[PDB]
Amino acid sequence: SLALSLTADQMVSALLDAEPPILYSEYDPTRPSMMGLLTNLADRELVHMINWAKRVPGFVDLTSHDQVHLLECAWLEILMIGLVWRSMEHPGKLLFAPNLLLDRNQGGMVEIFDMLLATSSRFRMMNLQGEEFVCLKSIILLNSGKDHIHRVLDKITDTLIHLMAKAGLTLQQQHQRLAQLLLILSHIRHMSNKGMEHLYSMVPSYDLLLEMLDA
Amino acid sequence: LALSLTADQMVSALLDAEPPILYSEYDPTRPFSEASMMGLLTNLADRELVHMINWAKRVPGFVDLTSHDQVHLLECAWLEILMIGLVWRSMEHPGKLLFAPNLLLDRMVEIFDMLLATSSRFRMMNLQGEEFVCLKSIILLNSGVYTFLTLKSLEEKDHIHRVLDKITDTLIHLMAKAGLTLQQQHQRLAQLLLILSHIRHMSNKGMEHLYSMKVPSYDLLLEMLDA
Ligand SMILES: CN(C)CCOc1ccc(C2=C(c3ccc(O)cc3)[C@@H]3C[C@@H](S(=O)(=O)Oc4ccc(Br)cc4)[C@H]2O3)cc1
Ligand SMILES: CN(C)CCOc1ccc(C2=C(c3ccc(O)cc3)[C@@H]3C[C@@H](S(=O)(=O)Oc4ccc(Br)cc4)[C@H]2O3)cc1
């Protein structure tokens, strides 16, 4: 409701404020296992994601059932785009955590690793902005999982275009960049799908996410 | 040169390059079994793949790439391309999937529903044929582009993004010609491209269940391109 009256600037500021912190993996630096560190990290990241999602404009207007469905579909995509975003300044490496920086040598699992690296390289080449990044995350949340959702998605599109226009991009450059960003989301969906496979080759259930949202 | 075309030239090229609608095996044993229907769909897809290569080679910019890169794009995109074609054919048939004119099926059920929802989505958006062929070309060029390598490889990936930008210009031009406002233009462009992520999802789920007891090799795709 109120999310549909939000301006582009208000949408950006809201998403920037809802942004989760960068968490550390739990290991002792005084000491001389990887999948355990990632699992522990992803579990703590999940808690912050639920609170982030609740602060995404229009999301709370949805029924509790629809909120869970979106999170169930998007959670791995959200984690992955976050990883890719914070790894953007580290070519050839993935920054899972500030104290957990890995290259493909240490790295299902190499296939996904390379796809993650390629996305990070793509973001860096496009000079993806933080304001654009938070918009993409919100898009992933709302799109991966109907009328209200699509109105909000149109708002985020307006927000992206407004950001580009403010940055001095021409009208042609605006829709081109918009297209480039949204097409990357297809690769992110692909990575998540491949990712789920290897997670069933050893995940928050519907009830788990419902209980977290209620809290 | 694909980058020299105009929006109208691009549309005309894509429309002319459209593959034919094929028929599945005539008069199969009905009712179907799980095996017999998969046999029909497999035979149909195999014959469709032939015309897809012919189509792909006529997509502006595609033949400019090395044969190796062309195969890689097809490897990543072929199922997506088959599925969006299916979704397009099924638009005027609510609740049904038109795999072929002689194979219209109503309500692997999960993928069926995802395909129905995508078809209804295209129907609700009033997707145009001109828009459709643009989206299909985008899939071909984009689905495998994020997995390239040298200076030559840098030029290859760079060339693809330019053609992709060109198709974006073409989609926008179609929308502006239709009379849509600039706001409606950016919004509709976004809606169409977000659907491509769903098509990716259905393709991945499709690949999964295909490996589940039920894919064209590099050598096959390469040979057909050379043929
Ligand atoms: C109860 N549940 C919530 C438990 C979930 O536990 C999990 C959940 C996710 C993960 C993984 C990753 C991940 C975790 C947090 C994050 O901020 C970014 C990425 C990356 C992607 C996937 S993958 O396993 O799907 O892909 C990769 C595999 C190996 C490597 Br190296 C890189 C990626 C795997 O590595 C690991 C354990
Ligand atoms: C290249 N060759 C070596 C191998 C090709 O073999 C294949 C290739 C494709 C297919 C399938 C489909 C398909 C075929 C042609 C087409 O124009 C559109 C879709 C649909 C989607 C998938 S699915 O089996 O993954 O999804 C569905 C399942 C059931 C139903 Br009903 C509908 C979809 C399956 O049914 C089956 C066998």
Curated annotation (Swiss-Prot), chain A:
Residues 7-215 form the NR LBD domain. Residues 1-215 are annotated as: Self-association. Changing R86H: In ESTRR; highly decreased estrogen receptor activity. Belongs to the nuclear hormone receptor family. NR3 subfamily. Widely expressed. Not expressed in the pituitary gland. Selective estrogen receptor modulators (SERMs), such as tamoxifen, raloxifene, toremifene, lasofoxifene, clomifene, femarelle and ormeloxifene, have tissue selective agonistic and antagonistic effects on the estrogen receptor (ER). They interfere with the ER association with coactivators or corepressors, mainly involving the AF-2 domain. Composed of three domains: a modulating N-terminal domain, a DNA-binding domain and a C-terminal ligand-binding domain. The modulating domain, also known as A/B or AF-1 domain has a ligand-independent transactivation function. The C-terminus contains a ligand-dependent transactivation domain, also known as E/F or AF-2 domain which overlaps with the ligand binding domain. AF-1 and AF-2 activate transcription independently and synergistically and act in a promoter- and cell-specific manner. AF-1 seems to provide the major transactivation function in differentiated cells. Binds DNA as a homodimer. Can form a heterodimer with ESR2. Interacts with FOXC2, MAP1S, SLC30A9, UBE1C and NCOA3 coactivator. Interacts with PELP1, the interaction is enhanced by 17-beta-estradiol, the interaction increases ESR1 transcriptional activity. Interacts with EP300; the interaction is estrogen-dependent and enhanced by CITED1. Interacts with CITED1; the interaction is estrogen-dependent. Interacts with NCOA5 and NCOA6 coactivators. Interacts with NCOA7; the interaction is a ligand-inducible. Interacts with PHB2, and UBE1C. Interacts with AKAP13. Interacts with CUEDC2. This is Estrogen receptor. It is linked to Estrogen resistance: A disorder characterized by partial or complete resistance to estrogens, in the presence of elevated estrogen serum levels. Clinical features include absence of the pubertal growth spurt, delayed bone maturation, unfused epiphyses, reduced bone mineral density, osteoporosis, continued growth into adulthood and very tall adult stature. Glucose intolerance, hyperinsulinemia and lipid abnormalities may also be present. A lipid is attached at C135 (S-palmitoyl cysteine). Phosphorylated by cyclin A/CDK2 and CK1. Phosphorylation probably enhances transcriptional activity. Self-association induces phosphorylation. Phosphorylated by LMTK3 in vitro. 17beta-estradiol binds at E45, R86, H198. Residues 1-215 are annotated as: Interaction with AKAP13. It comes from Homo sapiens (Human). Changing I78C: Loss of transmembrane localization, no effect on peripheral membrane localization. Impairs activation of estrogen-induced activation of NOS3 and production of nitric oxide. No effect on binding to ERES. Nuclear hormone receptor. The steroid hormones and their receptors are involved in the regulation of eukaryotic gene expression and affect cellular proliferation and differentiation in target tissues. Ligand-dependent nuclear transactivation involves either direct homodimer binding to a palindromic estrogen response element (ERE) sequence or association with other DNA-binding transcription factors, such as AP-1/c-Jun, c-Fos, ATF-2, Sp1 and Sp3, to mediate ERE-independent signaling. Residues 7-215 are annotated as: Transactivation AF-2. The modification Phosphotyrosine is found at Y206. It is found in: Nucleus; Golgi apparatus; Cell membrane.
